[PDB]
C-alpha cells in the first residue's frame, strides 16, 4: 500500500538474516495523524524468540573470534551508511513517532556519533599487563564477550538509544536479540538492514517485533530463565525495570537499566533568568516531555519566584504544538503512544485531588478545546496542552514520573533546602542548577543524588560521549555511552603465566 | 572461660561502635578439636540488623564527606596494626577454622596487601575530564559512594576475603553492615576492633553475628527490600547467590557474587609431569579442597594418562592430614563446619550410584578407619580421606562443586577436546593448563569460559592485585581486587558546566 | 609538462592556505625510472619558514579553542576522502618513491587507520578528576595543546608516518609546520590538500618543501632557537636526531625522534625454519631494506645454523627486483634517493675491509652486472642486488644501520648468548624471535633492550594502534601511535578549586 | 664535634653502599646562625661520580629484575621509618636550611605520602593488552626501567622534592646516582641511610656530594656524554635547566626539569579580600619566597586596587622573621644560601633603576637596619625585609624570578587583561585567581599558560598526588607526582605474539 504521507510497509522479523512473517499482524499508525498507517508487522510468539536466541548463539562462535578491529570496520561502514540515510531516517522518524525534524535529525546524529566512537574502540578495548610478585611470572587481563544479549528498547529515541546498546554489544563481540518498541518498528527494521549493508554477518543481529506485557517483550525476559541470554539491556518504566532486574538477578546477569526519572532543575536567586527560563522551558517541552530526562520540577529560589514564574508562563504560552510533518516550526507534536496519553490525562485529576494549583493547561487539545498556538488538526491524533502546576514537595505530582508536556514549579529558600527538595524523589537520573556563585554550584554538584548534573544547562541534551545513567529508582548502576559501557558488554578474564619450573 | 587451647571468648555485635549482646547464644567449636570451644556470641535478630543498617545510614553523612586521602590514612594504620597482629591472627585462624599456619599467615597477608593497595587509592579514585562538543562548556565524571553496603562472607578465608569487600567499600566512602560466617566470628570481631584502633569512625563499620538460612544472613538479604542497602556483596553457594541476585535485582542493586566452581585443570601430553602433579595436588588439597577455586577435574591428555595417574596417586598417598595446631607440617586439617563434611560424605554415594571408579579414599578418617599419614586424633573433629575418582563428563561428580579433599581424573584427547570438556560444567571461575606448546596455551587461554586462568600454575593462588571473579554460575560479572573492584562500591556522576551563557543543543 | 608515466607537476609551499612559489626549484625524479620527472617545487628559504610558523601561531588561537569533537569531524572527513583517493595515492606513491603497489596501498591504509583512531579521540582525550585531602576542595587535570609543532619526515613512508605526527598534532589542538622529504613532495602537497578538503582551517597546516642539511630542514630546526616551535617531531638518522635533540633540549622541548635501528631477529633451534625464513626474508627485503625496522642481523642458533642458512639463501635467490610501476609482482624496486644508494654501495667495501664473508650479492644491478630475477631496465634507476653476509659481532656491518637490501647472519649458541649478541648494537628499535619453548620467548621478551618485539613474527609490520618507537640510539623515549602519542602533543594542566573560603595548608 | 645547636657531622659519599671520604672538605653552616656548623663532607671529583654511575649500572641487573611488588615493600618500610623519624628530620631541616618547623614537618610529610603512593604502585604499573587486527595473534605493552638515573636537587625542599624523583625511579626498577644540594647534605645522607634501613640493596642508590657549577653537579651532567646515564632529573634555575636540557638532548635523554617561575596571582573585584590577602601573603612569604611556586606578581582588579593594597600591607607589616630554631612562631627565617641573598639584594637596585615604586622593605635586616617584627639576632645570618613593589608589566621585576621575600602589585582592569598580563612572563609554572563568578574562573583556567592553577587558593601548596610541573621556561613537559611521573622513569615495550604458523 501507499499510506497518506508515504508507503505503508509490511515486513517480518529478522532471524539469522532472513525475513520471517510469523504471527498475528500488528500495525503502527502515524501518531501525528492516525489515518496514515506507517507499518504492518508480526507478533513474535515466544518460540520464535527462542529460535532467534539460538541463531545468535550459533553466530557468536565466528563473530566473537572475529578480530575486534575488523568488527570496527563494520561500524565504520555503518557510520557512512547512516550519514547517507540521515535525511530519510529523519523523515521516517517524524512519521513513525512524531518527533520534530530538528530533534529527529539529532536522534540519528547520536547513532552516527556512537558508531564512530566504537568503530575506533575496535583498536582499543585496552586490558592490562600487571607485575607479578613472583619472579619468572607474567599477569594479564582481557575484556571478553559475554555471549547473547537480549535488548528491549522504548520508542521515544528510536535510533539513538538502541545504538547505545546494539553497537557496543556487537563491537565487543557479543551477538544480539533485539525487541524494538511497537511504536517504532519501521526504523528498527531499517536500522537492522543498514547494519546488514554495513557488513554485519547474519545472526549476529536478530530482530523480533511485538508488544511488551503479555507479548514478545515479556516472552523475551522469561527466556533468561532458560539461560538463552548471557546479558540483558532495557530502557523503560521503573515498574518493568524492577521485574527485569529480578529475573536477571536469579539468572546471575547484570542487566543495564535506564528507568526514567523526576528530574530537578534549580534556579537560584543569582541566576540569569532568561537563560534559566529557556532551560526549564526546553527541559519541560522537548519531545513533548516524553524523555527519561525531561524536567519534573523547577525549584525556584524564593527571592526570584514571582519574577521567574511570570516569565516562564510567558515563554510557555508561546509554545507551538502540531503535526511536525506538516509544521516543522512546531515545538512538540503528539504523544508517542496511547498509554502515555492516558497516564498524563490522569495526572490532572491526581493534581486537583491532592490540591496542586494548576497555572496553565486545559488537558487534551481538540476542536471543542482548542489551543491558541496549535497548527493542524488536533483530532487527527493525541496532542496535549502544555501544563504547569505549583506543587508541594511530598505530593504525587512532585514524586511520580509523568511522560507528557507538564512541569511543576516549587518555591525553595536555601541552597540548603533546594538540594534537600531536589533529592525528595524516588529517582536520581538527571538534574540541573542555574547559578553564578561557584559555591552554590559546588554544593548542588556534590549534594544531589543523581547520575548526571548540569550547571547553567538543561536537564536534557546529555552529550553522547559521557556516561548516561541514573542512581536510585532510575537504574542499577550501569552506564551507557563512552568507555563506561564496556563494563556492560564484557567480562574480565585474568591470566597468569608461569615461565619458571616452580610451584610458588 | 578457659578453653583447651586458649580462652573461650563471649562478645556481642558491634553497632555504631558499641558491643550489643542481643539474641540467642551460638558457639563456635575448634573444628580441629571440638572439645576446645573458641567462642560464644549472639544471633542478631532481624530488628537489630535493621538498627545496624540505620547506624550505618547515620554515619555515612560524615564518612562519605571525609576526604578520600584521609580515609586512606585509616587504612595505612590498619596495615601497620595488621602487621603487628599477624602472628596472633595466624594462631587464632588455625584455632577457629583449622587452616594450616602457612595458609593462615597467607590469609592475613592478603588483607595487609589489600589494605596497602587501597590506602594509596585514597589519592587516586581517578574520574575524567572530557571535551565538550560545544564551545565554552566543560564535562567531568566523578566516582561516588553508593551508601550502605551489606556484606556476607564465608569462613574458609575469614580475614582475606572479607577485606576484599570491607576495605574498598569504606575507602570509596561507603558505610558497612557485615555479617560474618558463624565459622569465624572471633576473627571478625578482632578485625572490626583493629579497624576501630586504626581510626575508623564508629558506625562506619557495624558487625552483626549469626547464621545464614533462617538466621541473620537471611534477615540481612531481606532488608534490601526495605532499601536499607544500596549495595550487597556475598561469597557463598550458587544456590544462595541466585536468591540474593534476585532480591538485589528487584531493588536495582548490582550485587557482588563469588559463587565457587568446578575448576578444570588440564595436563597436555607435552607437559612437565612432576610440575603438573604438584599443581593438581596443591589445587585439590589446599585448604582440604574447601576453596571456591579448588580443582574439580584434572583433564589428562590420553598419551600421558597412565603415567600421570600413577605419579599423581603416589603424590596423593603422601598427603599429611591432622590437627594443624599440634602438627603444623600437615597439608590440610578438618572441615570448617559440619555442613561441608555432610555434603562431602554424600558425594561418595552419588559417586557409587552413577558409577564413578573410586581410585583412592575411604571416607571419613576415624580410629576405626585410620589414615596412614594422619597426625593426631581424627575423632576430635571432622577429617576427610584424600579422595580420587575417574569420572565420565556429564556425571554429577563431574559437574557439581564438592567442598572437601576430592578430585576427579578424566581422559581427554585433543587440545580440541580438553577445552570442550573443561567447559562442560555450570561453573566458570578458575582454570589451569600445563603445556609448553605456545599454540596450545593460546587456544585454552581463549577457548575456556572462566574469569581466571593459570598457565603451568595451579587453579588456586590468585595474586591479590588481579581481578578475582567468575563467569557462568560462578558469578554475575563483578570483580574483587585491584582497580576493578572500584566499579562495585561506586557509581558514575556526570557533570556538565556551561560558561557560555546561551542554550546550545 | 607531461612526464613519461604521468604529469610533471609544479607547485609551491602552502602557507596560511595559499600556494607560495618562493625559492630555487628542486626536482623529484621517478626513482624506478629517472627519465620520468614527477615534480618541480621550491626550496623554502628560512624566512618563509619563519612566516609559515607565524601563520601557524595566528591560526592556533581559533583552532585550539575549537571543540575537540569538532576537530575529530575534520579527521572523519579525511578518513572518507583518503578512502576515495586510496587508488590514486597508491599509484602516485609507486611513482614518487618506488614502493611496490601492495606496500603503498598499505602505507595509505595506515593513514586511514590513524585518522579513524583520532577522529574518535576527539570525544576522549580523557584527563582526571582527583580527590583533595582537604574538605570543600576539588582537583582536576586537563590535556592542553603545546602550540606550533614543527615536523620533519622521511620519504620511505611518505603518507603513513607523516600522518602519525600530523593527525594527533592537529587533533589535540596544535598547529603545524611540515617539511616533507624532497623524496616525496607531490604526495605531501596532495595530503595537505585532502586535509583542506576535509575542513582543516587554513594556517592550521602549513607545508614548506625543501631539503635537509643546508636547506629548509636545517632552517626549520634552527627556528626552535627563535621559539617559533613549542614542539618538534622528526624521523631520520641518529646523527641528525642527536643534533635536533640538542636544539630542542636548550629550548625546553621534548622532541619525538624515530631514528632507525639495527634490528636483531633470532632463530632458535626449536623454531619452524620455513616460517622463520619467511620472516627474516620479509624483514630484510621489504621496501628494499629501507625501513627504520628492517632486520640488520639474523642470529641463528648453532644447531640449525647450516640448515637455516641454506634455506635462507635459496629464498633470497628467489627475490624479484624491478620497476614496480611496470612489474607489480616484484618484491622491491629502486633506492628512494641517491644518498642511500651511495651509503649502501660503500657498505661492500667496509665489509671486505673488516673481513665479513660475502655469501651473496654483486652490488648495483646494471646491464653489465645483471640480476637473474630482475624485471625491466636496471640502469633507469638505482637498484641493489639482494645482499647477505656472515659477520662477527663487534664489526661495523654488525653495529651500523645500512638502508638497502643487505642482511647479516651470525652464529649464536645459548638463548643466553642470542640475547647478549642481539643487544650488542647501539640501536634498540625493533626485534624478533622465532621459537616454541615458552621460556625462551619469555627470556628474550624481557632480556632485549628494544621498544618493539615480535614473537614468531618479522621485525617489520608493526600494527598501527600499538606504540611505535625505540630505546637507545633509536629514540629518546616518546611513542607514536595509539593513546601513547597523546603525551607528545599535549601538556598536563593541573587545577585546584577551593570552595570552602579558608586558607588550609 | 658538637656544634652550637647539635652535633657537627662529618661523612662521605655513599657508593655501592659504602661511605667514601674522598675529596676536599666542604661544610654547611646553619643559615639561621652561621656560628653553628651542621656538617663537613667531601667534594666528589668527576672520576668518583664515574664510579658511582658504574656501581649503579652493576646493581641494575638484580634490582630491575626484582618483582615490582617486592620493590614496593621496600618503600612500605620507608614509609614506616620516615614516620618514626619525622620529628628528627623536622629538627634537622630547620637547622640545615632554615625552614620553619611547620613547613619542615610538611616537607617530610610529602615524602611519606610519596612513599606510600608508590609502595602501592608496585602492584599497578599497568600496561595494556590490545586486540590484534589479525587472527591468532595477541598484542601487549609493558613499562620498562630506563637504567641509571642521574638526579640533581636544590635544597629549599630538601626531603620532599628529592623523594618525587628518587622513589618513582627505584620503584620502576631504575638505579640512581644522586647529587644533593650542598645546602642540605646531612638530610640527604640521612635519607639515603633510611632507604638502606628500609631494604634498598646497595648500589641501587648512590649519593655523591659537592657543588654545582665547576663542581660535582657539572661533572655529573658532563657524564651524560659518556652515556653513563639513561635518564636525568633536575630541579633548579632556568639557565642551568636549558644547559642540562641541551646535554640530555644530544644524548637522546628526556630529562625532567622543574625550573621555577614568576607565578601570577589574580584578585578580581568580586573576590573575598581577606581570603585573597591571606593567599597572596602566604604565596609571597612562605619559605621566605624561596619556592619555585612563590608568587611573583599580585594582579589586583582596578575597582578594589586601593582597598586590597592597604589590607595587604597591613598583613605584610605583621610578618614575623627570625631564627626558626629559637622562634618557631616566626613566618620565615634566613636565606638558604648566599647566592639567593645576593640576587635578591640586586633586585632592589634593578627596581629603583627601572622606576618601580617600593612600597615596603629596607633590604637586609641588621642591627643598623633593624626590622620591627624580627626575633633573635639578624647578624647571625642573612635575613631579608619583607618587600613590596608596584611595577609596570614588561619590566624586569615583573618578568624575572627573584628568590626571596619580595612581591609586586600590578593594577589590571579586565578579566581579559588580567589573563594577558598573567601570561606576560617567560615562565608558566603556577598560577592563581581569587573570584566567585564561575565565568571569570573559567576564562582564567583556560586562558592562562601554566601547568598548575589555583582557584581561591595560593600559588603554593600543590597537593602531592597531582602532576607537578611547568610549561614555557618553567620546564620541558614532564610531570613529577602521581601516575604522571611514570612516563619519566620508564619506556614502552610493545610486544606482538603470533600463535598461528602464517606470515601476514
Ligand atoms: Cl513500547
Ligand atoms: Cl511503560
Ligand atoms: Cl499503548
Ligand atoms: Cl502550592
Ligand atoms: Cl644548590
Ligand atoms: Cl641557581
Ligand atoms: Cl652559594
Ligand atoms: Cl607603578
Numbering used by the authors:
A (entry chain A), D (entry chain A): 4 to 507
B (entry chain B), C (entry chain B): 4 to 508
Q: What's written in the study?
A:
However, the presence in ALDHTt of an unusual extended arm that wrap the facing monomer through H-bonds and salt bridges shows for the first time how the tetramer is not merely a dimer-of-dimers carrying out their functions independent of each other, but that the interaction of the N- and C-termini in CS-related monomers may regulate active site access in NCS-related molecules.
To probe the significance of the tail and its fulcrum points, two truncated tail mutants were made: (i) ALDHTt515 which removes all residues distal to the “Crook & Hook” and (ii) ALDHTt508, a mutant which removes the “Crook & Hook” entirely but retains the “Notch” to try and model other tail containing ALDHs. However, ALDHTt mutants could only be crystalized in a closed and compact conformation. The ALDHTt508 structure is “open” as the “Crook” of the tail has been removed, but there is still no movement in the anchor loop to an open position. It is worthy to note that the electron density maps were of a reduced quality in the C-terminal region of the truncated mutants compared to the native or the full length recombinant proteins, highlighting the role of the extended C-terminal tail in stabilizing the overall structure. The similarity in tail orientation and active site regulatory loops between ALDHTt and its deletion mutant structures even without intermolecular interactions between the end of the tail and N-terminal interactions hints that active site access is regulated by additional domain interactions. Interestingly, both truncated mutants ALDHTt508 and ALDHTt515 were slightly more active (specific activity of 1.068 ± 0.004 and 1.069 ± 0.012 U mg−1, respectively) than the recombinant wild type enzyme at 50 °C (0.965 ± 0.043 U mg−1), perhaps due to the presence of small amounts of ammonium sulfate acting as a stabilizing agent. Attempts to assess enzymatic activities at the higher temperature of 85 °C were not successful as both mutants rapidly lost their function compared to ALDHTt530 where it was still active up to 4 min, consistent with the Tm of ALDHTt530 of 84 °C. Taken together, the relative stability of the recombinant enzymes was in the order ALDHTt530 > ALDHTt515 ≈ ALDHTt508.
